[PDB]
Symmetry: D2
Subunit: 262 residues, 4 copies
Amino acid sequence: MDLGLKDKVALITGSSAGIGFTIAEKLAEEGCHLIICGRNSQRLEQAYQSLAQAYPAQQILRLVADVHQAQDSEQLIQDSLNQYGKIDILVNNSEGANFLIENLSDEDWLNVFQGKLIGYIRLTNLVLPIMKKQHWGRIVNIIGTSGKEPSPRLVKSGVVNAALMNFTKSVARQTAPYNVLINSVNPGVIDTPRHREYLEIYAKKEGTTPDLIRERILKTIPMNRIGTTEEFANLVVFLASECASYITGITIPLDGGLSSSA
Amino acid sequence: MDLGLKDKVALITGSSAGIGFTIAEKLAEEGCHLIICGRNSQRLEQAYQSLAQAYPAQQILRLVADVHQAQDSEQLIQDSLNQYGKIDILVNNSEGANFLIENLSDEDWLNVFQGKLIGYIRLTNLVLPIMKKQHWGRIVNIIGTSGKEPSPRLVKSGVVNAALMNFTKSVARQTAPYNVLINSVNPGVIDTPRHREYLEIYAKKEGTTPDLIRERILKTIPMNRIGTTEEFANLVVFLASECASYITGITIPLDGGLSSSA
Amino acid sequence: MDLGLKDKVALITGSSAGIGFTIAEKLAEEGCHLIICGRNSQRLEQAYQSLAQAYPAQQILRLVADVHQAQDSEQLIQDSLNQYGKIDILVNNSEGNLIENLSDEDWLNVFQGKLIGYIRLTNLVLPIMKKQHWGRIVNIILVKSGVVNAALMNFTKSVARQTAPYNVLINSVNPGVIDTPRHREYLEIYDLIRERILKTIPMNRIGTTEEFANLVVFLASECASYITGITIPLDGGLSSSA
Amino acid sequence: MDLGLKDKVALITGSSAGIGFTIAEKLAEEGCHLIICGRNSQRLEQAYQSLAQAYPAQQILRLVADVHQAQDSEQLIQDSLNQYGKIDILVNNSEGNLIENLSDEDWLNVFQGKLIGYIRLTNLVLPIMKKQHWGRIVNIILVKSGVVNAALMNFTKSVARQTAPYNVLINSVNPGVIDTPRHREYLEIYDLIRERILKTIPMNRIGTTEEFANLVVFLASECASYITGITIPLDGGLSSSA
Ligand SMILES: NC(=O)C1=CN([C@@H]2O[C@H](COP(=O)(O)OP(=O)(O)OC[C@H]3O[C@@H](n4cnc5c(N)ncnc54)[C@H](OP(=O)(O)O)[C@@H]3O)[C@@H](O)[C@H]2O)C=CC1
Ligand SMILES: NC(=O)C1=CN([C@@H]2O[C@H](COP(=O)(O)OP(=O)(O)OC[C@H]3O[C@@H](n4cnc5c(N)ncnc54)[C@H](OP(=O)(O)O)[C@@H]3O)[C@@H](O)[C@H]2O)C=CC1
Ligand SMILES: NC(=O)C1=CN([C@@H]2O[C@H](COP(=O)(O)OP(=O)(O)OC[C@H]3O[C@@H](n4cnc5c(N)ncnc54)[C@H](OP(=O)(O)O)[C@@H]3O)[C@@H](O)[C@H]2O)C=CC1
Ligand SMILES: NC(=O)C1=CN([C@@H]2O[C@H](COP(=O)(O)OP(=O)(O)OC[C@H]3O[C@@H](n4cnc5c(N)ncnc54)[C@H](OP(=O)(O)O)[C@@H]3O)[C@@H](O)[C@H]2O)C=CC1
């Protein structure tokens, strides 16, 4: 399927590892030029070298930026514009809340809202005039199924994820006549560094092994397997495509059937 | 129907006018003692005199407090405890976001999150240990249908409302074994001072009359009428009751059929 | 709370036992006159005697009827109308690799049960309620079951939208685990099993028919005058626990 | 993007025109062999010739069948299996005061259409797909219509849960306003009417069959290997505009 992405410019946030890195690879494969970013310079340079060596025909700009920070996010967009003169695609991908409700303080909630929640809203606001001006844009938000059905070990995430799903609908409605399409994808369980970190921290809290936490997860997923970042990236790349030109304002679970199992 | 509310202590926030005032009246009618509050002292004293004269057999504590503010909210709960020694019911009711997305700044969003969103979360956190300790509690959050299906003239509200609906489910799950039940009610269009203020500000933005804005609203509601605060309060009072002892974690539209019309 | 139900006439289907029986009790307590019905004439007679003794001032009509049959349902409505001259409230309450071995005939049979049963009775009472400008309809809602229930939830919304201008309000309630005869029977054909179910309910307790009935009676009241087209889970928090 | 569809066998129902026809084209373009079907033999012959000429290297079986009839649907599946030895993909695509005047017979007739039609064809292909450990089923989903569509959305979830361990994935797509023959016909029996519909669509444009088909082909691909049980609106933003 020709996805019409040749020479499009994609900004993928949080793209030195996990879901974000594989999305960057797959967009480069379809002919996009990239902007990649992350907080840790060493990890970012490793990712940059991997992508540059794999897709030497594509332009790739790597920038150290914390996209929870206003200054870094504003400067990321300006650097991107200085390099490419346009941004066609934005993938919003950044870290959510950390791993009883009465015990969470105001500060705890405020740090949550000042992370991924305003992070995605801010970068959306920053790219909208760019994409509107050219009557072509795609924004894909990487959210999480907890926004739809919350999980006990994920309370703050669920609140943030619900908010972002609602935001997605409101902005989609406003930007639709400009051919600026905005969607979200809710990962189920996808095998990334963060997922494997979740396996360690909860095996300890629960006094068990990563393997047993994983067997318990696998029993909940109809497919009886944890998704790969490639499987996840395929949908994101489709939504970022010319082929997805009538799809906007929706949130799609990518979860091995987890939502059918609720 | 005996609702089992005699001598229960109810805190109704934002209760000097509109939905909140009528909820206070109806809870007093069923035999509760009250705490009422608001920001404007003059408006609050008028409400206090109205309720005290109508329900002289009930105790009523009135306090000036902005329940978007941490200090005022903490002190409201301590004052309530000093007066009554317990809080049985909390009705979360406070002002939402004010009347294009790219144009909203970080500060604008942050003020939103520091209003009703953290306001309801904070007061929930403050009352939970009180209600848990006595294995009896009810929290009813007054949200808004925009959390379910957002409206163009209500973007920031929708984001906040979605978040709060998700929060409601997560906290309900955790507090259920303590007989501390938490639900939300999503008003449609209910005839309050704020609603009538909405009619003025949008008749001006649109160059028309309040009457015509109202006729346009009425065509969207299946019942062909705007709800009264009494109709709205009936459900809240039911949810705050002993009769609602198996209902928790849900959000109920109270909207004249507006949700069936989406 | 004054529910405004004195002298209202309520038809509660499946009311000889369980959830339907306790809904009938609570409606009588609020001042309704009743029609109660069921297939098991003996269970229905027991129910009727219990209600008549507890509520000697209320009128109670009992009718043997299978509300999955057209002719029975038509005559149930005609018989109720003849007795009372009005029907104010209807509570619809009737009984509801693996998937690819369900035949055409299997699926047709489930559609001819509770699905068309609730639709048909709704249709039969709507003219009467529209004439009155007063009505309340409350619908008590594996693979087959889920399909029927999704269908009925959507039917509830569609009808509510159309009938709202006549003050004929229709809503649905979705029970979690409620201590009914089916439930106590459903345990034994499968505490032990109970202890596993309790672990899945956040409240850690099975609901009572009384707890369930309270909500149905609210929705059937004058106090619910601005509530229509909605489906409410009454489930001890199951729906907050995916 | 390589969809992994070379030599996969796809049955697309209602494929002589409109959405089904363009889905068949796009599948052939990705390397599938096809079964196309329809009731109107003349329209079906036109479709078949168009496809055979555009995709001379692909196999295309055309069968006249009414996929709301049991016997036609059984023979459609048997005939496809005989020709190809496998069925990898099924796309279910067939035709779908007011409420209280819908009779029992009216409702029974709608349930015997698209509702049981999609369920029956699903059931008929599931053994074949489970044998293969490879399948994709995509379901193209007033009062009657909404009831059927809610039922089918829920059916999609239930079947997806059961068949996921066999790599038989099932999803649904809900079109908004798509420029099909029914649509251009549906205008005239009621631009003018078009200009009012366009005002309701945030994108301010009616979708093309090509735009719709692209998503169906994605969902039917190897690339959608972790996606099952979901329903996706393809609607130019209608669903973000209540
Ligand atoms: N994996 C899963 O199963 C699930 C994932 N998700 C969501 O998916 C998204 C991706 O998660 P996942 O791939 O597992 O995470 P990983 O931690 O495996 O990868 C995250 C990547 O993003 C970078 N990153 C994180 N936060 C920021 C930031 N503020 N600024 C810049 N770079 C950042 C990280 O680099 P560095 O640390 O150097 O910045 C790293 O490159 C997240 O939004 C997460 O909440 C949700 C549900 C389930
Ligand atoms: N009316 C409707 O149709 C709708 C209402 N809602 C929601 O319902 C709730 C009630 O709205 P409504 O009755 O129309 O509002 P009104 O403005 O008519 O009444 C609000 C009352 O609450 C008080 N109040 C507001 N904010 C605060 C605060 N931070 N601290 C203390 N008191 C406060 C006001 O007094 P003072 O100003 O003196 O503090 C007043 O007594 C709100 O959460 C609103 O978002 C949502 C959708 C539709
Ligand atoms: N209990 C639960 O937790 C759940 C219940 N539900 C739904 O709740 C409703 C009531 O369930 P519950 O009380 O547990 O069931 P029970 O079997 O305990 O009680 C059913 C009552 O309805 C009557 N009844 C059943 N079918 C018919 C019929 N076709 N015509 C006339 N009367 C009938 C029975 O009498 P007779 O046998 O004499 O006709 C009996 O009086 C049903 O709609 C069910 O599908 C759904 C999910 C969970
Ligand atoms: N177009 C839209 O915007 C919307 C569409 N839908 C759904 O989308 C799907 C396709 O719609 P669309 O292309 O607009 O419809 P069209 O009528 O334009 O095309 C329908 C195609 O399906 C065939 N068909 C219909 N019924 C049967 C049957 N029982 N057996 C065999 N073939 C059949 C027709 O051929 P023949 O007549 O020869 O059998 C024709 O090839 C349907 O499932 C519809 O309900 C839902 C909502 C909106």
